[PDB]
Amino acid sequence: NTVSGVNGPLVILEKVKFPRYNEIVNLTLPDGTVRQGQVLEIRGDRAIVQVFEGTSGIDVKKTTVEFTGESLRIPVSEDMLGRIFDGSGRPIDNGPKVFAEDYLDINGSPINPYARIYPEEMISTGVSAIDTMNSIARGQKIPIFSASGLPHNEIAAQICRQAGLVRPTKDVHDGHEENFSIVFAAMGVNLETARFFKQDFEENGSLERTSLFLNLANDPTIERIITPRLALTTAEYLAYQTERHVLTILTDMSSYADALREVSAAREEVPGRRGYPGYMYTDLSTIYERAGRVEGRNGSITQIPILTMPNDDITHPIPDLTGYITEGQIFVDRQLHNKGIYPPINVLPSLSRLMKSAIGEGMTRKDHGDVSNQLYAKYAIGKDAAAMKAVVGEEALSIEDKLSLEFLEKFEKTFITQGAYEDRTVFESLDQAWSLLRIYPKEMLNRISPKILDEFY
Amino acid sequence: NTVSGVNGPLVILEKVKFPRYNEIVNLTLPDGTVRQGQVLEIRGDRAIVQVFEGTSGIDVKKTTVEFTGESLRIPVSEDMLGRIFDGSGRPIDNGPKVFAEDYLDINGSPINPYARIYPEEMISTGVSAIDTMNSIARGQKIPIFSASGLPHNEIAAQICRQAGLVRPTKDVHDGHEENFSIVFAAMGVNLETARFFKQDFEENGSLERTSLFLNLANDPTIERIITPRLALTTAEYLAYQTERHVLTILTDMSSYADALREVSAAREEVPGRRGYPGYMYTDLSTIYERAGRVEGRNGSITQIPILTMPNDDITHPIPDLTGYITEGQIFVDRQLHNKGIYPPINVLPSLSRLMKSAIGEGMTRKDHGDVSNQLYAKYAIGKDAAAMKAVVGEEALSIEDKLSLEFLEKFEKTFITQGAYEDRTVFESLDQAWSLLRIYPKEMLNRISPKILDEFY
Amino acid sequence: NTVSGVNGPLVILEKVKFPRYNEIVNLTLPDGTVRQGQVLEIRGDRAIVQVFEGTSGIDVKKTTVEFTGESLRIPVSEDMLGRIFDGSGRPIDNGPKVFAEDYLDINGSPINPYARIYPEEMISTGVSAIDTMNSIARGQKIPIFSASGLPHNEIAAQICRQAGLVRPTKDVHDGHEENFSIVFAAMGVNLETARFFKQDFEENGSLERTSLFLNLANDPTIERIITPRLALTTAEYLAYQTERHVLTILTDMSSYADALREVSAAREEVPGRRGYPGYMYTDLSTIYERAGRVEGRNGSITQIPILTMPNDDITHPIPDLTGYITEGQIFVDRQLHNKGIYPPINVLPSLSRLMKSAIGEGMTRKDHGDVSNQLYAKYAIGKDAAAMKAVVGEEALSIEDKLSLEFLEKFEKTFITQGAYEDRTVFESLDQAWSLLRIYPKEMLNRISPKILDEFY
Amino acid sequence: YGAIYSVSGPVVIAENMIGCAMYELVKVGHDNLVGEVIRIDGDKATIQVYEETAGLTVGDPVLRTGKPLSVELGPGLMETIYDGIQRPLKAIKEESQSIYIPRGIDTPALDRTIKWQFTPGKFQVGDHISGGDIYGSVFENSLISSHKILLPPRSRGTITWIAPAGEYTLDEKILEVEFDGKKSDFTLYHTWPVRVPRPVTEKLSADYPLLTGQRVLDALFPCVQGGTTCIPGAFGCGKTVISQSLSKYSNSDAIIYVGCGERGNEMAEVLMEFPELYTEMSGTKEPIMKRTTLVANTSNMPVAAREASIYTGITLAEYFRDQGKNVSMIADSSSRWAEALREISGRLGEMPADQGFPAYLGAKLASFYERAGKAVALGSPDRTGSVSIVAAVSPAGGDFSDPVTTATLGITQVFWGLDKKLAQRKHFPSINTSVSYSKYTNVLNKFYDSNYPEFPVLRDRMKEILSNAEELEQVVQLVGKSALSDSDKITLDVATLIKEDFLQQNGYSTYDAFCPIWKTFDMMRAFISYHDEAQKAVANGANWSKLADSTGDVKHAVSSSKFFEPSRGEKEVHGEFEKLLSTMQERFAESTD
Amino acid sequence: AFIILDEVIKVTNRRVNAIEHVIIPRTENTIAYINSELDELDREEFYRLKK
C-alpha cells in the first residue's frame, strides 16, 4: 500500500504479506528519488524495513511502494579484480560495471564449505614482530588490537604493501604455491584514511589484484553493515574459482559495532550490557565463520580485522567478544609508539592458538615454535622486572635480572623496530632471536629441550 | 478451563471467574499424566498458573482443567520425621507420604502464635568460632554467609552433623531439657552432597529425628520455593503442639532467590534493582517468619539459613537484604581456606547485635560477652597492620602492631581450626580465649571492666 | 468533572481537550477544599494534572473541575518586597493582596533580555573569602558547592544578610549610584530554617531590602521547582525597568533537582545516570537563563545558586553539569568547619574565571589583582607545609616551610574567620591581607609588582 | 458494590468503584478484610489490602464505607502495645489465641470495654469552643494524669452538652457540638487521618535542649527537643542496644516507640524489658510502660501495616503535642520503611527512579520530618509541646550512597555518626566530627550559657582535638612514626581519653541511666585543661617524657572518670572532677620545673 | 650519622617509586571496572521499565 510511519531507520510500511524474507522493495519518493530497502520484519499486513539509502525524509501517502520480488543477493564475479567500489557496489571512481556470473545471498552462509581440515601453511609479511610470536596460518583469523593514539592504519598499510612481495619468496619454500589477492573493506573511515589505503595498493602495483570497498561514516549506518559482508561474498567467489589466498582486511570494527548498536536501541529488542547489542556477538560471528580453506583445497580466506579500542580497554564489550571468536590477537601498545618504535606492535599478550599448526618443517623450521616459547616467556618476565627495577633499585635486582634487562632493550630496538619497507624472512628472525637469547645460561633456558639448545645457543 | 497461551515457563490459562487465590488446579495433559498448578495471579477472565510438575506439554485445545476448589496447604504430622520426601512431599522411596493429623496453611500467616519473649537460652553449634563470638540463642536467626571457592557445602554439613550432638552438652548447661529434632530442606544442591547430608544424619543416629525434603534444579522453580514453606510449617507444628526445640536448617537460599527472579517475566509485577523483584524482601520475610519462641515458651524454632554469595561480595542483593531482616551475620571466607584452614571463619565483620542480652551466667559466664569483645579489637588491628606491612615495609610498625601480627596467626590456626567430628564445650572455649590474650599487658585492655578481668584472668 | 485516576503525584482528569497547556484548573471537592493544579499534558479527552497542595483524596464522581483560562504568571510589583510568601507567591505574612503591575511568565523566560556584554563592576557579599579571592562582578553566576557536612543554610543566609550593608560604603566610593535588592528563594526547607532566615534579616535590617519566598518540604514537589522560577521573574522586572543591581540567592538546587527526577511515574520519558534525567542539563539551564546583564546595563541580575553534595562526591551528576555551565565555582570543605573556622571556605580549588574583569576602582582598588595572586599561592604552600611539619618535627623544619605554616594558621584564623554579625567590606579585607603577607620578606613576594610591594608589604 | 477484578499478591484490584476516593477505607471480599484504595486506574481501583490473601476469589463484593482510612487516638493508648494498623495486640492474644494478628479476623482499633474517669474541661454550656481546646482530661496512669481530652483539629461550634464528672466508657457520649446543625456527637476517642499533617497553633523554632542521657551525644552536638536526627546503623553493630537504651535514658512526658519493620525478636525484647526497669521520673507498677505507647510491626507481617506504621506513629506524637505534652518519637529504622516503599513501588507497578527505589521516596521522607518540631500547643489556652524525631538511617545498598541516606541528610539538621571500624572494635556509638553536624548548635550553646556553663568555649577545643588527630593519623599510617611533634603526640593521647570515656559507653559505664549537662561539661573541662597545660609545658621547655611521667596520678584519674557517678558536689556538679582541676595545676608546676 | 643517612635515604627513595607506579594505578583500574558495571545496572532498568 503506502507508508504508514518511520521511527528512526526503521520504516513502517503497510503492505501485504506476500513478499519473502529479505525481499527488496522500492520506495517512490515524490522528490524524484528512489530508495531501496530490504524487509527486516514482516507482520500482519505491514512490514518494518531498513533503507540502505537515506535514514529520514520518508512521508505518508506521498510515498508509495512497488515490491521488486527479488531477495537481496550480490552479483559476485571473479573479474572483479582491480575494480573500485563503494559500500554498496556502485562505482565512485568509475571502475567497471558489476555484471554477474553468479548471485550469492548474504547471510554469512553462501554455500559455506568452510574448514574441516585446519590450515598449516605459513604466510609472512616479513614482519618479525608479527610472524614469530603469532604464526599466521592460511585460514586463521588473528585481529589487530590497538587503541586510540596509535597508527593502526599505518600497520594495516604495512601488511598490504609488503604482502605481495614476500609471498613469491615463500612460494619457493612451499609456504605458498599460488597467487595472493587482497580484498580491502574500509568501514566508516575518513576520506583521508581511505585514500591512504588506495595509495598503498597503487604504490606497490597491486591495484589490479585488490578489490577496494570504501564506506564512509556519513553514508547511512545501514549501508555500513552491508559493506563488510559484500566484501566477504566476493572474497569467497575468488577463493572458489581461481584458487587464491585471499586476505581480508576489515577495518574498523568499532565503526561497525556503533552501527549495530543504533539498530538495537532503536529496535524493539532490549540491548545487552553497556547499551551494546544482545545479539552483538551474532553480528560479529557472521564475518568470522567465513574463514578457512574453500573447496578444491588451494584457495582460502584468511582474516586480519582491525580494531581500535574507543575507550582504551579490553574491558569493553567489543574486545571481549572479538577475542573469543578469533584464534589469537596481535596487540599494539601505546608506550612503544610514544618512544619511537615503529611498528609499535607489543608482544606481551599477543597470542596464537593455532601457532603449532601454522609452523611446519617443509617451509619453516620446527625450531620456530620452540624459540617462540622462549621469546614470549622472556620478554614477558622482562617487562615485569623492569617496572620492578624502578621500585626496588638494585637491592632486589640480580645479576640474571640485569641480563633480562638487556634482552628487553635489545628486543624492543631491533626485533620490533623495522621501517615500512623492510622485509625479513623467517630464517633471519630465528637467527637474530638465537643471538639475543644467547647471554642467558643453559639452566636459564629451560623451556626448550637440551637437543635444540646445545646445537644453537 | 483451557490454555490460551504459555509465556516463558509461565502458563496463561483462559478461564471463568470463580477460583480461590492460590487454588490448586489440575491440568489434564494428553500423555497419561495429570499435574497440579497453583494460580499465581487471578485476573479478569484469565489466570496465570505455573504448573508444579514439568514445564512442557501444555496444549491449546487438548487440555482440560478442573478446579480442585482447595488452595494448597501442607498436611502436617509430627510423625513426619524419619521419612524421606521431595520438594512436594511426595515419596521417592515409594510409600512415605506426608499424611496428616491436622491441615495447616503453607504461609503460616493464619496461626502465627509467636511468643513475645526474646531469645533466652544458649544454643551452640560445637564450633568454637561460632559459639563464643556470635553466640546463638534459641529463636535467634543469624545467617551463615559463605562464598563459593569454598567447601561451603562441607561447612553446612558439618553444622547438620553437629546439630544434636551439641544437645547433651546443652542439657548439662541447662539451655536445653527437651527433645531435639531436625527439619532439613534442600534446594538446588549437588547429588554427592545430598548423599553427604543423608549420611551425616545416619551417623548421628538422628535419622528418625529428621525430615528431608530434597529438591533439585531439574524440578520446577515454583515448586522449589514451596519446599521450605512445607518444612517450616511442620517445624511450627513440632514447636507449638509438643513444646520441642526445633532446628530447621534451610539450604540454599541462593537457589531460592533465583527461582523468584525467573518468575515475574510475564507477571504484570515488575522487577526493581539489579533485575531482582522489589518484593523479594517480602518473599524472604515469609520464610523467615517461622523462627522464634513459640507460645508455651518451652518450645522454640531456631532457624539457620545457608547462603553462598554467588558473586562473593556482601553488597550483592541476595546477602544485603537478608542481613537486614536478621540480627547480625557470620562470615566464612576464601582467604582462610587458601592457607589450609577448616572451618575457615573470619570474625571481623561478624557480629550479632542481640548476643549480650540473651546470654547470661548460668549456662555461659559473665565474661563470655567481655572476652569476645577484646578478641575483635585485637584481631582488627592485626589485619590493618598486615596490609600496611606489605606496602611500606616494617617502618609503619610499632610495638603493639608486631604483637598484633602474631596474635592474628595464633588465633587463626589454634582457635578457629578443629576436626569435622570435633565438638566443643563453651566453658572450654572461654579458657582458650583467655590464653590467646595472655601475651598482652592488662593496661592495653579497655573493652572489659577491670572488675571482671581480675576474676577470670 | 470526573477524575479518572491518580497514579502517584500525577492525576488524570478526564475532561475534554479544549484547555491549553499549563492552564490552571480547579479541583472542586465535596470537602469544601479547592486545590489548583496545572496541566502537564493535554491529550484527547484527558489532561494530566499535578496538584500543588496534596495530590490525592479526590473522589471520582463527587468532584467537579473548572478551567481558569489563564496560564500561570506572576503578578509582579515593586511594592511586593519585604514580605514572606509561599511557593506560589501568596502571602503567609497575613499581609494584604499580592498586587500586580504586570503579569510576567515564569515558564523559563519573561522576555529574556540577557546581554551580549561581558561582566565588570564589583558586587560585594560581605564575606572576605569570596569577595577578594574570587571577585564577583554582576551578571556572573558562581555557585557555592557546599555539603551537608557544612551548615549550608547558615552560610547562605550570611551572604544575604551581610550583602546590602556593603552598599553605603560602595556608594561613598562610587561603585553604586542605584540601589541594591536581594531576592531570596528557599526550597523543601525545614520549618526552623524558614523562620531563621527572616529573623537574621530582621536583626541586620536587611528585611525590607529583600523579598523571601519559602516553600516548605511537606509542600509537593511541583510547587518547589516553581518557587525559584517566581523569584527570578520578579527580579528581571526590578532590574530592567527601575535599574537595580540584584543578587539572587537560590538554595537548594539539590532539592530542585530531586523534584525533577521525582516527577515521571506515568510519563514515557526515561531518566539518565544515577536516576537523574538525561535532560537534567536542560532543567538547570532554565534557572540559568535568568541571570546576566539586563538590557540598558546599569541594572543586573546576579545569581549565586547553592548546591549541597549529599555524599561529598564531585563526580555526582548534579555538580558536574552545573560546573560546566557556570563561570567558576566556590568549594566549601568539611575539614575547616571541623577546626572550628566559620565560614570554612577553603580557597584551595575555588576559582573566579573573570576575576580581573570584575575589579577596578571605587568599589575595589588597583592592588586587588596582584594581592589575589600572592595570597592563593602562599596559602596552597601552607597546606603542604602542615603535612611536612608532622613528619620532620618543629625542630628540624625549613625556613620557607616555617613561614608557610605561620601563614596557614593566621590566614585561616583572621581572613576566613569572621563573626556572624561582622561585615567585611572589600577595602577592609585587603588591609588584613597585608599583615599576613608581611612575614615573608620582599624577596619571597614577587607575584606582586614592586610598585605595590613598596606601598604595602 | 465493586466486583474483584484481579487479586495479584496481597494487592487486590476491583472494578466498579465510583464515588470513591484515593484513601478510602473499604471491606475487601466476602472475607471482609480491612483495606484501602491507594490509587485508581479508570474504573479499576488498585487497593492495598492489609490482611493477606490465601483464598479470596474474584467477583466478591467490595464495599466502600463512605470515609477515609484513619486511626483512633483516645484514652488507654499508654500501657498497651498495638500494631501499625493499630489493633490491640494484647486483646488479640486472648480472644483469637494467636499472639500476632490472624487472617480473616478483624478487631476494632481500640479496646471497647475499658472505662475511664472523665473530669470536666474549662468550658460550660453555651460556650464557644475550638480545636485542641481542652474539653476535659482523663486520669490515664499513675505517673501521668496529663491526658487532655480535646475538641478535634478542624472543629469549632458551641457545646450543646457538657456531661458532669464521673465514670464513663469511651463509646459512651459525653459531648455534643453544634456548629451548623448537629456536627456530630463526640466521645472520648477521636479520629485523625494518617495521610495529613495534624493542625497546629503555630510552629516555633527549637531552642530548648533535651538531654539524651548519653554524655557523648550531648558533648559534641546537643540534641534538642523539636529536632531531627539521623543515627547510622549497619545491622550488626549494636544499633538496637543503643536505640532501646536511648529510649529509656531520654525523658519526655510521653514517648512513642515505633518499630518500623523489625526482627520481631527486638520488639519482643522492649515489650519485656520496660516494665522490669525503672523510670528516672519515679514511675511505679510497670514504670516505663505507663509512659510509652508502643507501635509494634515486624517485617514478617503485611507490607501495608509497615507502610502505615510511621504515619500512625507521627500522629500519636502529634496528638499528645496538642495536649501540651513534650514527646520523644524514636522510629527505628527508617530504611526499613523505605524497603517497604520499594515493595509497594514494584507491587502496584509504579515507576522507580530514585536508584531502583520509589518516585515518591524523597518527598515521603520529608513529609514525615516536617510533622516533627517544637510548637505552641493546639487550642488557645497555650501550652508548649514538641516532637523530637529520632530516625534511624541505615544502609539500603551502599554505605551512605543508598537513596535513603542521601535524602535524609538533605532534610536532617542534626547528624551523629557511627563508624563501622570502631563498632567492631567496641567503641560505639562513635561520633566523628566529619561525619557529624548540628545546625541547632549556636542557639543551644547560648541556651547553656544562660543555664550556668561556659559550654561554647569547650565545644571549639573538643572539635580541634578530634579534628587534628584524623590528619596526623594519615601521616602516621603511611610514613610511620620516627618523629611526630611534641604537640602532635599530646593531641593523640588526649583524643584516646575522649574515646574511652565518652564515645565508649553502653553497658560499660555504670552510670548512664541519665547523665546531667554539668557533669559532662565538668568531665570534658578536665580533658581540655590537661591539653592546654600540656602543650605549653613542652614549648617553655620540659621533655615530653618527663611530662607524661609527672602528670601520672591525674592522668589515670581522668582515664577512670567514666565509672564515677554524682555523689560529691551538687546533684549534677561532681567534686572529684572539681578537685581534679586544682591538682592538675599543681602537676604542671612539677612538670615545667 | 652519614652512614645511617645513606641507608635511610635508600629506603625512603624505594617507597616513593612504589606508591607512584603500583598503588595509584591499581586504585584507578579497580575503580573503573566497578564503575562500568554499575552505571549499566541503573540504565538497563529504565529500558526494562520503558519496554
SS3 content of chain D, % helix, strand, coil (to 5): 35, 25, 40
C-alpha cell at A332: 599494539
The rounded distance, in Å, linking the Cα atoms of C359 and C369 is: 8
Which phi and psi angles does C352 have, rounded to 5°? -120, 120
Binding partners of B (≥3 Cβ pairs within 8 A)? D, E
User: How many angstroms separate the CA of residue B160 from the nearest CA in chain E?
Assistant: 37
Inter-chain touch C338–D17, beta carbons under 8 Å: no
Contacts of D345 in chain B (CB under 8 A): 272, 278
The rounded distance, in Å, linking the Cα atoms of E26 and E18 is: 12
CB pairs under 8 A between B and D: 219
For residue E8, what is the nearest residue in chain B, using CA coordinates? B395
Residues with Cβ within 8 Å of residue C145, at least 6 apart in sequence: C307, C309, C314, C319, C323, C329, C330, C331, C332
The rounded distance, in Å, linking the Cα atoms of C306 and C253 is: 6
Using the Cβ of A394 and the Cβ atoms of chain E, whether some distance falls under 8 Å is answered with no
Using the Cβ of D483 and the Cβ atoms of chain E, whether some distance falls under 8 Å is answered with no
The rounded distance, in Å, linking the Cα atoms of B21 and B67 is: 12
The rounded distance, in Å, linking the Cα atoms of C70 and C72 is: 6
The rounded distance, in Å, linking the Cα atoms of C59 and C70 is: 25
SS3 track for A397-451: CCHHHHHHHHHHHHHHHHHHCCCCCCCCCHHHHHHHHHHHHCCCCCCCCCCCCHH
Residues with Cβ within 8 Å of residue D82, at least 6 apart in sequence: D88, D89, D293, D294, D295, D296
Contacts of D353 in chain E (CB under 8 A): 46
- Please list the residues that pair with B308 across neighbouring strands: B146
In contact, B190 and B258? CB cutoff 8 Å: no
Residue type (1 letter), C44: G
Specify the DSSP class assigned to residue D561.
Answer: G
Residue that has been written with the C-alpha cell 524419619 in this structure: B82
Positions of E strands within C21-61: 23-28, 34-43, 46-51
The rounded distance, in Å, linking the Cα atoms of A375 and A433 is: 8
- Taking the CB of residue D185, how many other CB atoms lie within 10 A of it? 12
Query: Of the candidates B273, B274, B393, which has its C-beta nearest E11's C-beta?
Result: B393
Inter-chain touch A391–E40, beta carbons under 8 Å: no
- Taking the CB of residue A376, how many other CB atoms lie within 10 A of it? 20
- Please list the residues that pair with B218 across neighbouring strands: none
Contacts of E49 in chain C (CB under 8 A): 270
Residues with Cβ within 8 Å of residue A248, at least 6 apart in sequence: A182, A183, A185, A231, A232, A235, A301, A302, A303, A304, A305
In terms of DSSP bridges, do strands A299-309 and A144-147 run parallel, antiparallel, or are they unpaired? parallel
The count of C-alpha atoms lying within 13 angstroms of the C-alpha of A189, restricted to the half-sphere facing its C-beta, is 26
Could you give the strand order of the β-sheet that contains D147-150, starting from the edge strand earlier in sequence? D147-150, D134-138, D115-120, D166-169
Query: Of the candidates A270, A273, A393, which has its C-beta nearest E14's C-beta?
Result: A393
The rounded distance, in Å, linking the Cα atoms of C192 and C395 is: 50
The rounded distance, in Å, linking the Cα atoms of A246 and A298 is: 11
DSSP A17-84: S-S-TTEEEEEE-TTS-EEEEEEEEEETTEEEEEESS-SS---SSS-EEEEEEEE-EEEE-STTTT-E
Which phi and psi angles does B354 have, rounded to 5°? -125, 15
Inter-chain touch D356–E49, beta carbons under 8 Å: no
C-alpha cell at D114: 475499658
Positions of E strands within D411-535: 414-415, 437-438
In contact, D516 and D211? CB cutoff 8 Å: yes
Specify the DSSP class assigned to residue D513.
Answer: S
**Chain E interface, Cβ < 8 Å to C:** 39, 42-43, 46-47, 49-50
Which phi and psi angles does B118 have, rounded to 5°? -80, 145
Task: Tell me which method was used to determine the 3D structure.
Answer: cryo-EM
Using the Cβ of D398 and the Cβ atoms of chain E, whether some distance falls under 8 Å is answered with no
C-alpha cell at A222: 545501514
In contact, D427 and D499? CB cutoff 8 Å: yes
Please state whether at least 3 CB pairs lie below 8 Å between chains E and B. yes
CA distances from C122 to A66, C90, C136, C204, C303 (A): 71, 34, 6, 22, 14
Give the orientation angle of helix A221-242 with respect to helix A253-265, to 10 degrees.
130
Residues belonging to chain E: 51
Using the Cβ of E45 and the Cβ atoms of chain D, whether some distance falls under 8 Å is answered with yes
Distance between the two ends of chain D, CA-based, in angstroms?
A: 95
Ordered alpha helix ranges (H), D258-333: 265-276, 287-290, 303-323
User: How many angstroms separate the CA of residue E30 from the nearest CA in chain A?
Assistant: 11
Q: Which of residues 272-291 of B touch E (CB under 8 A)?
A: 272-275
Inter-chain touch D410–C262, beta carbons under 8 Å: no
Taking alpha carbons only, the member of A134, A136, A189 closest to residue A331 is A134
Contacts of C272 in chain E (CB under 8 A): 43
- Which own/partner contact pairs does D91-98 have at CB distance under 8 Å and 24+ positions apart? D97/B113, D98/B110, D98/B111, D98/B112, D98/B113
SS3 track for C163-174: CCCCHHHHHHHC
**Is the preceding omega at residue D429 within 30 degrees of 0, hence cis?**
yes
Inter-chain touch E11–B273, beta carbons under 8 Å: no
Positions of E strands within C310-391: 328-331, 351-352
In terms of DSSP bridges, do strands C300-309 and C245-251 run parallel, antiparallel, or are they unpaired? parallel
SS3 content of chain E, % helix, strand, coil (to 5): 95, 0, 5
CA distances from B134 to B129, B137, B432, C101 (A): 8, 9, 16, 73
Which phi and psi angles does C93 have, rounded to 5°? -70, -25
- Please list the residues that pair with C250 across neighbouring strands: C185, C305
Could you give the strand order of the β-sheet that contains D156-162, starting from the edge strand earlier in sequence? D128-130, D156-162, D175-178, D182-186
Give the orientation angle of helix C426-437 with respect to helix C368-392, to 10 degrees.
40
- How would you class B406 by CB atoms within 10 Å of its CB: exposed for 0-12, middle for 13-18, buried for 19 or more? exposed
The rounded distance, in Å, linking the Cα atoms of C46 and A47 is: 32
* Helices then strands, each counted (H, E), chain C: 14, 17
The rounded distance, in Å, linking the Cα atoms of D289 and C202 is: 46
- Taking the CB of residue B426, how many other CB atoms lie within 10 A of it? 22
The rounded distance, in Å, linking the Cα atoms of A112 and A110 is: 5
Query: Of the candidates E22, E47, E48, which has its C-beta nearest A391's C-beta?
Result: E22
Count Cβ neighbours within 10 Å for each residue of D9-24 and write b for 16 or more, e otherwise: bbbbbbbebbebbbbb
SS3 track for chain B: CEEEEEECCEEEEECCCCCCCCEEEEEECCCCCEEEEEEEEEECCEEEEEECCCCCCCCCCCCEEEEEEEECEEEECCCCCCEEEECCCCECCCCCCCCCCEEEECCCCCCCCECCCCCCCEECCCCHHHHCCCCEECCCECCEEEECCCCHHHHHHHHHHHCCCCHHHHHHHCCCCCCEEEEEEECCCCHHHHHHHHHHHHHHCCCCCEEEEECCCCCCHHHHHHHHHHHHHHHHHHHHHCCCEEEEEEECHHHHHHHHHHCCCCCCCCECHHHCECCHHHHHHHHHCCCEEECCCCCEEEEEEEEEECCCCCCCHHHHHHHHHCCCEEEECHHHHHHCCCCCEEEEEEECCCHHHHCCCCCCCCHHHHHHHHHHHHHHHHHHHHHHHHHCCCCCCCHHHHHHHHHHHHHHHHHHCCCCCCCCCHHHHHHHHHHHHCCCCCCCCCCCCHHHHHHHC
> What region, left, alpha or beta, does residue C225 occupy, with left being phi > 0 and alpha being psi -120 to 50 degrees?
alpha
The rounded distance, in Å, linking the Cα atoms of A134 and A353 is: 9
CA distances from C5 to B28, B300, C264 (A): 41, 48, 16
Query: Of the candidates E10, E18, E32, which has its C-beta nearest A391's C-beta?
Result: E18
With the C-alpha atoms ordered E13, E17, E22, E24, is the resulting torsion angle positive or negative? positive
Residues with Cβ within 8 Å of residue A172, at least 6 apart in sequence: none
In contact, A242 and A78? CB cutoff 8 Å: yes
Contacts of D235 in chain B (CB under 8 A): 323-324, 326-329, 353
Specify the DSSP class assigned to residue C21.
Answer: T
The rounded distance, in Å, linking the Cα atoms of D566 and B252 is: 55
Inter-chain touch E49–B274, beta carbons under 8 Å: no
In a mutational test of the E interface, the residue from C261, C267, C270, C273 whose CB has the highest number of chain E CBs within 10 Å is: C270
Give the orientation angle of helix B191-204 with respect to helix B152-162, to 10 degrees.
20
User: How many angstroms separate the CA of residue D50 from the nearest CA in chain B?
Assistant: 12
CB pairs under 8 A between C and E: 12
- How would you class A67 by CB atoms within 10 Å of its CB: exposed for 0-12, middle for 13-18, buried for 19 or more? middle
- Please list the residues that pair with B227 across neighbouring strands: none
In contact, C103 and C74? CB cutoff 8 Å: yes
SS3 content of chain C, % helix, strand, coil (to 5): 35, 20, 45
The rounded distance, in Å, linking the Cα atoms of A154 and A150 is: 9
The rounded distance, in Å, linking the Cα atoms of D529 and D585 is: 9
Residues with Cβ within 8 Å of residue B65, at least 6 apart in sequence: B1, B2, B13, B15, B25, B26, B27, B28
The rounded distance, in Å, linking the Cα atoms of B327 and D394 is: 14
Count Cβ neighbours within 10 Å for each residue of D444-463 and write b for 16 or more, e otherwise: bbebbeeeebebeebbebbb
User: How many angstroms separate the CA of residue E14 from the nearest CA in chain A?
Assistant: 5
In contact, E6 and B383? CB cutoff 8 Å: no
The rounded distance, in Å, linking the Cα atoms of A361 and A354 is: 16
Query: Of the candidates E17, E36, E48, which has its C-beta nearest A390's C-beta?
Result: E17
Q: Determine which helix (DSSP H) or strand (DSSP E) holds A233, and give its type and residue range.
A: helix A221-242
Q: Annotated binding residue at B261?
A: no
Taking alpha carbons only, the member of C112, C251, C245, C273 closest to residue C177 is C245
**CA B139 to mean position of chain CA atoms:** 13
Which phi and psi angles does D498 have, rounded to 5°? -70, -45
Query: Of the candidates E15, E45, E49, which has its C-beta nearest B392's C-beta?
Result: E15
In a mutational test of the C interface, the residue from E12, E39, E42 whose CB has the highest number of chain C CBs within 10 Å is: E42
Which phi and psi angles does B32 have, rounded to 5°? 85, 15
User: How many angstroms separate the CA of residue D474 from the nearest CA in chain C?
Assistant: 10
CA distances from C285 to C113, C163, C213 (A): 15, 26, 21
Distance between the two ends of chain E, CA-based, in angstroms?
A: 75
User: How many angstroms separate the CA of residue A265 from the nearest CA in chain E?
Assistant: 9
C-alpha cell at D263: 526482627
C-alpha cell at B344: 575457615
C-alpha cell at B80: 513426619
Contacts of A271 in chain E (CB under 8 A): 47
Residue type (1 letter), B169: T
C-alpha cell at C56: 490525592
User: How many angstroms separate the CA of residue B6 from the nearest CA in chain E?
Assistant: 20
Using the Cβ of D54 and the Cβ atoms of chain E, whether some distance falls under 8 Å is answered with no
Taking alpha carbons only, the member of B208, B209, B257, B236 closest to residue B139 is B236
Residue that has been written with the C-alpha cell 487497593 in this structure: D47
In contact, B159 and B249? CB cutoff 8 Å: yes
In contact, A61 and A2? CB cutoff 8 Å: yes
In contact, C161 and C206? CB cutoff 8 Å: yes
Resolution, expressed in angstroms to one decimal = 6.6
Please state whether at least 3 CB pairs lie below 8 Å between chains B and A. no
Count Cβ neighbours within 10 Å for each residue of A148-165 and write b for 16 or more, e otherwise: eebebbebbbbbbbbbbe
Residues with Cβ within 8 Å of residue A21, at least 6 apart in sequence: A39, A42, A71
